[PDB]
Amino acid sequence: GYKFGVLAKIVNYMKTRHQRGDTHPLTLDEILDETQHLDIGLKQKQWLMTEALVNNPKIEVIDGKYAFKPKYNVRDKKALLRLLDQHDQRGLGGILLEDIEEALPNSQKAVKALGDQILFVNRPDKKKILFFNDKSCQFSVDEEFQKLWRSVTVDSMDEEKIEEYLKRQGI
């Protein structure tokens, strides 16, 4: 095994290092020192530099050095709000709750602060997807009204009777 295993180790190490508040970037040798990878090959080094830490969306390239990407992920209520607004405006769709949960520790506070602004979609497998509440036009009906609408069957009713009814009622 070689050239494919240590990438997971380094990405996990730098993620956990950022979890400790190390916002400052770190050089490759800094991580290599404490990860017991002093015997790492040169071709592994250049392959890492050219592909691994530039293709992933979790590594930021600044002043030549490499750091976390906390801006992309959610860390506050305002970031969640603006991300959801962008999703609603551009129609990109929602986002899984687990991504925000792992990005934002104690994400329930933002959820309960948003309240009705956030919308949840309940999947069969307990997973929840978050949507923005587009308040352009809101209208609601009574439960009795909804039962009345559901009582009337329309899927098993064809297109001849629909236009026969219009002339029957004389509109």
Contacts with other proteins by CB under 8 A lie at 91-96, 119, 121, 123-124, 129, 131, 136-142, 144, 148-149, 152, 154-155, 159, 162-163, 165-166, 169, 171
Contact indicator for 129, 123 with CB cutoff of 8 Å? yes
CB of 43 to other proteins, least distance (A): 36
Helix (H, G, I), strand (E, B) or coil at 59: strand
> Which of these, 38, 102, 23, 67, lies nearest to 6 by C-alpha position?
38
Give me the phi and psi of 131, to 5 degrees please.
-125, 155
CB of 93 to other proteins, least distance (A): 5
User: Which of 64, 170 has the CB closer to other proteins?
Assistant: 170
CB of 162 to other proteins, least distance (A): 5
Separation of first and last alpha carbons in the chain? 78
CB of 92 to other proteins, least distance (A): 6
User: Which of 38, 137 has the CB closer to other proteins?
Assistant: 137
User: Which of 8, 152 has the CB closer to other proteins?
Assistant: 152
CB of 89 to other proteins, least distance (A): 11
Per DSSP (E only), the strands in the chain are 59-62, 65-68, 95-96, 118-122, 128-132
Contact indicator for 94, 87 with CB cutoff of 8 Å? yes
User: Which of 39, 159 has the CB closer to other proteins?
Assistant: 159
User: Which of 39, 155 has the CB closer to other proteins?
Assistant: 155
Give me the phi and psi of 68, to 5 degrees please.
-75, 175
